[PDB]
Amino acid sequence: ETINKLNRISRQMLQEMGREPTPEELAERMLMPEDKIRKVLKIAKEPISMET
Amino acid sequence: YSYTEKKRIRKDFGKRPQVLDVPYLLSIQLDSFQKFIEQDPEGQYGLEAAFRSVFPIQSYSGNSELQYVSYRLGEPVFDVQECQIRGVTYSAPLRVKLRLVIYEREAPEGTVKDIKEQEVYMGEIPLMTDNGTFVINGTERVIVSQLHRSPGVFFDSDKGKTHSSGKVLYNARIIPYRGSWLDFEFDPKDNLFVRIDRRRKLPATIILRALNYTTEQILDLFFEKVIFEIRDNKLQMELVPERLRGETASFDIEANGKVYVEKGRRITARHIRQLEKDDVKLIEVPVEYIAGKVVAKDYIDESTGELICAANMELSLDLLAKLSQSGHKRIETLFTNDLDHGPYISETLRVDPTNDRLSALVEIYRMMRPGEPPTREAAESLFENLFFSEDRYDLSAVGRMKFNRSLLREEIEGSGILSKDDIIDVMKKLIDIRNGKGEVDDIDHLGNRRIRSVGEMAENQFRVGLVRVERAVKERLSLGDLDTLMPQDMINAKPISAAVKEFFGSSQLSQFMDQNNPLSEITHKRRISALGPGGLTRERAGFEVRDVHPTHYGRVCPIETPEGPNIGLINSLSVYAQTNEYGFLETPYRKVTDGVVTDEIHYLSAIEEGNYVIAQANSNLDEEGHFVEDLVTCRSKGESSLFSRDQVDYMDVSTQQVVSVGASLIPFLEHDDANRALMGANMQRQAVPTLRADKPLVGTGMERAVAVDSGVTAVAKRGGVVQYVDASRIVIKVNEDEMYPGEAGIDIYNLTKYTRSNQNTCINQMPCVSLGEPVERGDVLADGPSTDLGELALGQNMRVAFMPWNGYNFEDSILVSERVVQEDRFTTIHIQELACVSRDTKLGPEEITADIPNVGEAALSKLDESGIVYIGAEVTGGDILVGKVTPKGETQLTPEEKLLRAIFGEKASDVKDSSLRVPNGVSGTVIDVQVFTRDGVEKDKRALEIEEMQLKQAKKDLSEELQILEAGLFSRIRAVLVAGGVEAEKLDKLPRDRWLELGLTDEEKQNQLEQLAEQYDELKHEFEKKLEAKRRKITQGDDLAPGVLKIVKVYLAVKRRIQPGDKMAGRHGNKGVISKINPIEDMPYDENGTPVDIVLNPLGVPSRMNIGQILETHLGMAAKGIGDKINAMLKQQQEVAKLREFIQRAYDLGADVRQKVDLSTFSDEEVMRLAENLRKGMPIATPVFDGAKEAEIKELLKLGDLPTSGQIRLYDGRTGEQFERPVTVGYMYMLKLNHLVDDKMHARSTGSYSLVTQQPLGGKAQFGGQRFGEMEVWALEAYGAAYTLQEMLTVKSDDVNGRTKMYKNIVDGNHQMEPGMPESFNVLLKEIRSLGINIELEDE
């Protein structure tokens, strides 16, 4: 749910600001202390296939 | 001549006056991407085409529609240099004005309730640089132009191979630009068939029954009607006499008194013409001739409605007796023949199961989505969405042009979708090809080959993004509210930017620019690939695509393609060739009148070439344009033949149009075999840029176009007087006439110093102009890598002797004197980029501290207090550049190691040395250090030091920009105030602020003062705001990977000289590995005493048929002989009249040429600098197929004191006695290819091992291991070697116990192996055992 909130808010802000949102903007955009947003961004990565 | 043209003017042979100069060599890339991103007011190709095609988006009949207005691209946030430093795309945003409307109740034409019009962001698209290069992820990438089949209609044969019957088939094919294909083909027994894809063979006429056609009008469209009337009796036959051609009748055909056609006789056309002259329309036949005919339409009884005969039925006597009693005397039959009119459609109808429209649509909908039951309206919408929907099927303007052209239509425009007339005309044309008239096509023909480019492929991926987003917009506007949103919440910019970044980031057509040579850039941008999406692959295709078709002449170079797996699929675009409006290739020719060759030129495509007949470039004509013979060699239709004097239509432009830019820089290319010329032009890319640049003595005249018109050198945009020359910058004072009235200024050119190219070589710019020198517009100022004075200097010219010298030149080997390596004339400069990342593990974060466990202080003396190496400390292999330690824990110590720790009390530390180290076996200098740090992390001391360094550098540099720019501006102000109110000595005392506000007469001069004043103030404010912007770009944080703290990058500059093992090559394809690097004392030397520098091998020259290296060697000897005579006449201090005389004789010298020269140059100041530039050797241009012959080389050698035969006697360096049979010495221009040996050499004792199978993983510098593959195992089986193989694939490679047992036994000095079992075989057992298959090992 947190990952889908991050993708939704970073979908909304990308057409508001224009470049892409930095997580410093996600600090004041959301209610999380921006050091947890880094690890939520880290956990949400699917592993590479080892035959890629 | 211009100013650098008279600096060192190149002697030019050649006999053809060039009438069209070499065009802008990168026009494909830049012109394509100018078609891509440009505000086109119409439906011209571009982004406007994609928007106007995919928009308007409408709701699911909910009366809410989104339509389009315009777009705009913003300026990039980051310029190209900072973009290459940081790693982002060099991109631009994409603002689009969109307009949302909602309609009201029961008014489709009525007024909307509201409109909502705003701008919206949809992704970033990358911009092309000024040279044709994109930047995607830190690197500099080139998108190669693609070659594929033109959308349209192709009539192929596919002869013979089907079922070995000897019969040819024919297949027509409609290839769209976007949609499903279409095929029509015959079978071995004369039945037509349709295919909507490469799916199952369907009967043909069902697609006609899918277009609302009954059997009547199908047979009407594909056949002509023979009318049988019963004129009162006997069932007569109406006759057109042309219908009887080539036929044999079974009876006597009589017309108007006379029996013309006899029974059992073939009908001659004399009978036909007599029947035409005798006014013959209707003749009498028996009832037996209708036994073979087939009825056209439906015949019934009138009142009862019963069927006499349905359509497409043969007629027997029973059906004739049935149609006699109903009363019908009109009979319509189908005209058949075995040669002229084949009854193919009738046979296809007899094969076809269906009858009506609905069963046809049911058959197609069952035969495209099989297994599911059909439905009427779903089948109707399917066949709507196959070929006739505007959405899922599209021929472009090129598709419609070829589709009309190969059907011999009139209009060259039309709708994208098909129509009934289109498919019916294609079927008519296919039946006509089967009936013997017309011809098939061939796919190698470059009139049926379209060349795509960057703009078109980016446009198509952008359209993929727009349909992927319009699915979501249809989903949203179907659920669309009334007023809750500005119209940007509907659209996501993830798919659009995702698609375009996926194309530029990952494709077979978008690759790293080969950037180690200006030639390599300019020929990688000019590349015509046939691979990639929408094109053939190396596995599937194919031989005819690899081969050269005769329509490649002057469009695609035949002698440049990468020899290897893909030969000919990676073609290169010819020199003079452009790209047509419709995308095809087209080449220049000179229009020929009655006899006079006019200098006007017409670009001709391939299918327009075959109609005309085209003359030869190598022809001879007087000043009146008349050919000197009455017959001349030409080509008409792919056939070289000799035609008349005034039958010609076009002449070739120049002698060079058949080759590429890569091959045309091989001189004497007409004297080499095409194999070695292919290899020579294939390897002329791979020259490393040497430390100097050294002017090829044997050039082809194409060197200046490749030098200027690439992107490496700095071309002046406005000429003037050179004000300031530094290695960093060149500052030009523009002349008065070339200067704009507003924004006066002067020009400044910031050179690019020592920096990293993609192939690790050092791209560098160096000034070639001095202070206070006049320059022309378009004149070179700063030589790039491998460029001298605006020429192309790929390598260096060296004295060569062709003799076998003690076997050191055995197979192909080169042998070089020490005079080369002492001069550092092949010493090249490489730049490597080592990187040290510092992440955050879950055991703790890493540090960049200088304190490292268990290293010496002497190993750390090359570091600072911050732990990052100083700039400019020569390091070797193993030195520590970035001291980085990673936290670890839980040591799990053993027995007696734990005993030892207890004894000595030494704490096993909580950290591990994972520092960045120099790779094994290089050297060099640390020249540039960068520290990227995530924002919110403490920046250490050297990071702030680098920030202060770059901040002072940017502020000093922009202050110098503003200061020298306003120095030019105040020097213009002084030139203004002298005219009309001079202060000669009064002006320079009063300050610069009080020049802008001094009074003067109201004229254009006061308006000029107002302009220069406001430009001063605008540049001041612009300076201030862009300095603040540059500071906020430098000081801010940097985006990084998720979960990495900081990255320290260190640029090494290695200076690699030469050693045995390197590779060198002339431009003719004579490869060679330097074998021994002799001292100067051992070289062969002639009687003057000059030691030859490179001794090649003569045995390669008769075998490999490249004789042109000998001619290039002789003419190089000629060039350096002229250079030595000029050097002697300059060393003796001869007066300038003697030098003028000798240079005049050197430049006249030969047949009728194209090289008129001085005396028009200055008295001393231009001639003496020319002689200073000719003392190393007078260059010679040889335009490729037209240039210098043998007798001109002999006459140039007679100008020097050299022997005419070109072979000096030479003395051995060791025995000191003369070689018998005097040998060929000369000056060959040779190149150092970048297959250097120290990048290739490594070895492995014991390193890492692969995870899934315990084997040493292969690579470099992963320590690799030479893969002892399957053939080498067969080789050791072929010997008696068995212990070698047992250790070769168990102990040295695979066994997890055996390798450590072997290492122990070796360091104990006991050579012995304990073999055991390989590990990967145990993996194989677990893999078969992890199937349902039991596999075991057995008892004893």
Q: What is the DSSP letter of B1288?
A: I
Query: Are the C-beta atoms of B1209 and B1086 separated by less than 8 Å?
Result: yes
Residues with Cβ within 8 Å of B1326's Cβ and at least 6 positions away in sequence, in order, are: none
Interface check for A1 against chain B (CB to CB < 8 A): the answer is no
Chain A nearest-CA distance from B77, in A, is 9
- Count CB atoms within 10 A of the CB of residue A21: 18
Query: Are the C-beta atoms of B569 and B556 separated by less than 8 Å?
Result: no
Test B488 with A11 for CB contact under 8 angstroms: no
B519: phi then psi, degrees, rounded to nearest 5: -65, -35
Query: Are the C-beta atoms of B751 and B727 separated by less than 8 Å?
Result: yes
Query: Are the C-beta atoms of B435 and B340 separated by less than 8 Å?
Result: yes
Q: Tokens representing B650?
A: 């076009």
Interface check for A33 against chain B (CB to CB < 8 A): the answer is no
Strands B145-149 and B528-529: parallel
Q: What span, in angstroms and rounded, lies between the C-alpha atoms of B388 and B285?
A: 48
Breaks (C-N over 2.5 A) in chain A follow: none
Test B1043 with A15 for CB contact under 8 angstroms: no
Sequence letter at residue B768: C
* B627: three-class secondary structure by DSSP: strand
Residue B19's Cβ-count burial label (10 Å; 0-12, 13-18, 19+) is middle
User: Which of B1090, B948, B1093, B1105 has its CA nearest to residue B1031?
Assistant: B948
Q: What span, in angstroms and rounded, lies between the C-alpha atoms of B1157 and B1143?
A: 10
Q: Tokens representing B685?
A: 């890319």
Considering only the beta carbons, identify the residue of A11, A14, A42 that sits closest to B1043: A42
Q: What span, in angstroms and rounded, lies between the C-alpha atoms of B356 and B375?
A: 15
Number of domains in chain A: 1
Q: Give the N- to C-terminal CA distance of chain A in Å, as an integer.
A: 29
Q: Give the N- to C-terminal CA distance of chain B in Å, as an integer.
A: 93
B265: phi then psi, degrees, rounded to nearest 5: -115, 140
Displacement of CA B74 from its chain's centroid (Å) = 28
Residue B899's Cβ-count burial label (10 Å; 0-12, 13-18, 19+) is exposed
Asked if residue B542 has a cis previous peptide bond (ω within 30° of 0), the answer is: yes
Q: What span, in angstroms and rounded, lies between the C-alpha atoms of A11 and A26?
A: 12
Q: How was this structure determined?
A: cryo-EM
* B793: three-class secondary structure by DSSP: coil
Chain B nearest-CA distance from A1, in A, is 20
Sequence letter at residue B149: R
Q: Tokens representing B237?
A: 């036959």
Q: What span, in angstroms and rounded, lies between the C-alpha atoms of B705 and B660?
A: 12
Q: What span, in angstroms and rounded, lies between the C-alpha atoms of B732 and B719?
A: 8
Q: What span, in angstroms and rounded, lies between the C-alpha atoms of B1261 and B3?
A: 50
**CATH code of the domain containing B844:** 2.40.50.150
Instruction: Give the residues across from B259 on adjacent strands.
Output: B254
Residues with Cβ within 8 Å of B625's Cβ and at least 6 positions away in sequence, in order, are: B593, B595, B596, B597, B598
Enumerate the residues of chain B whose CB falls inside 8 A of the CB of residue A42. 1042-1043
Q: What does B817-868 look like in DSSP terms, one character per residue? A: EHHHHHTTSS-EEEEEEEEEEEEEETTEE-B--S--TT--HHHHTTB-SSSB
Test B492 with A41 for CB contact under 8 angstroms: no
Query: Are the C-beta atoms of B729 and B752 separated by less than 8 Å?
Result: no
Q: What span, in angstroms and rounded, lies between the C-alpha atoms of B292 and B289?
A: 7
- Count CB atoms within 10 A of the CB of residue B1189: 14
Residues with Cβ within 8 Å of B184's Cβ and at least 6 positions away in sequence, in order, are: B171, B172, B173, B192, B193, B194, B195, B204, B426, B427, B430
**Domain of residue A21, residue span:** 1-52
Rounded alpha-carbon distances, angstroms, from residue B11 to B4, B52, B1122, B1153, B1188 = 15, 56, 11, 10, 11
Test A14 with B77 for CB contact under 8 angstroms: no
Q: What span, in angstroms and rounded, lies between the C-alpha atoms of B1112 and B1224?
A: 11
B122's enclosing H/E stretch is strand B114-126
Considering only the beta carbons, identify the residue of B93, B935, B1039 that sits closest to A18: B93
B1072's enclosing H/E stretch is strand B1071-1078
Question: Rounded to 10 degrees, what is the CA torsion of B335, B341, B347, B348?
Answer: -120
Nearest CA in chain B to A21: B1039
Test B1042 with A15 for CB contact under 8 angstroms: no
Q: What span, in angstroms and rounded, lies between the C-alpha atoms of B515 and B461?
A: 27
Which spans in B627-765 are helix H? 661-664, 674-683, 703-708
B379's enclosing H/E stretch is helix B376-387
Test A11 with B494 for CB contact under 8 angstroms: yes
The residue of A8, A34, A38 whose CB has the most chain B CBs within 10 angstroms, and thus the best one to mutate to test that interface, is A38
- Count CB atoms within 10 A of the CB of residue B672: 26
User: Which of B802, B775, B803 has its CA nearest to residue B789?
Assistant: B775
B596: phi then psi, degrees, rounded to nearest 5: -100, 125
Sequence letter at residue B533: P
Displacement of CA B3 from its chain's centroid (Å) = 34
Q: What span, in angstroms and rounded, lies between the C-alpha atoms of B220 and B738?
A: 73
Q: What does B187-233 look like in DSSP terms, one character per residue? A: -SSS--EEESSSS--EESHHHHHTTS--HHHHHHHHS-EEEEE-SSS
Q: What span, in angstroms and rounded, lies between the C-alpha atoms of B871 and B857?
A: 19
Interface check for B1250 against chain A (CB to CB < 8 A): the answer is no
B758's enclosing H/E stretch is none
User: Which of B1314, B1177, B1167 has its CA nearest to residue B7?
Assistant: B1167
Enumerate the residues of chain B whose CB falls inside 8 A of the CB of residue A41. 1042
Rounded alpha-carbon distances, angstroms, from residue B860 to B752, B886, B921, B928 = 33, 18, 19, 19
> If you search the block for the tokens 């390091």, which residue do you land on?
B875
- Say what angle helices B454-478 and B494-505 make with each other, to 10 degrees: 160
* C-alpha triplet B377, B381, B382: angle, nearest 5°: 115
**Domain of residue B898, residue span:** 828-945+1052-1056
- Say what angle helices B1108-1131 and B1167-1174 make with each other, to 10 degrees: 130
Displacement of CA B1208 from its chain's centroid (Å) = 46
Query: Are the C-beta atoms of B521 and B513 separated by less than 8 Å?
Result: yes
* B1086: three-class secondary structure by DSSP: strand
Interface check for B77 against chain A (CB to CB < 8 A): the answer is yes
Q: What span, in angstroms and rounded, lies between the C-alpha atoms of B17 and B621?
A: 11
Test A18 with B121 for CB contact under 8 angstroms: yes
Q: What is the DSSP letter of B266?
A: B
Interface check for B78 against chain A (CB to CB < 8 A): the answer is no
Query: Are the C-beta atoms of B388 and B418 separated by less than 8 Å?
Result: yes
B1129's enclosing H/E stretch is helix B1108-1131
Longest dimension (CA), chain B: 138
**CATH code of the domain containing A47:** 1.10.10.10
Q: What span, in angstroms and rounded, lies between the C-alpha atoms of B1211 and B1084?
A: 5
Question: Rounded to 10 degrees, what is the CA torsion of B858, B864, B868, B870?
Answer: -90
Q: What span, in angstroms and rounded, lies between the C-alpha atoms of B53 and B470?
A: 12
Interface check for A44 against chain B (CB to CB < 8 A): the answer is no
Q: What span, in angstroms and rounded, lies between the C-alpha atoms of B782 and B765?
A: 6
Resolution in A: 3.8
Enumerate the residues of chain A whose CB falls inside 8 A of the CB of residue B492. 11
Residues with Cβ within 8 Å of B608's Cβ and at least 6 positions away in sequence, in order, are: none
Nearest CA in chain A to B95: A18
* B176: three-class secondary structure by DSSP: coil
Test B121 with A24 for CB contact under 8 angstroms: no
Rounded alpha-carbon distances, angstroms, from residue B1250 to B419, B1168, B1258, B1259 = 61, 67, 9, 12
Q: What does B516-535 look like in DSSP terms, one character per residue? A: SSHHHHHHHSSBEE--STTS
Interface check for B486 against chain A (CB to CB < 8 A): the answer is no
Rounded alpha-carbon distances, angstroms, from residue B1251 to B210, B726, B765, B1254, B1294 = 60, 55, 47, 6, 11
Displacement of CA B436 from its chain's centroid (Å) = 41
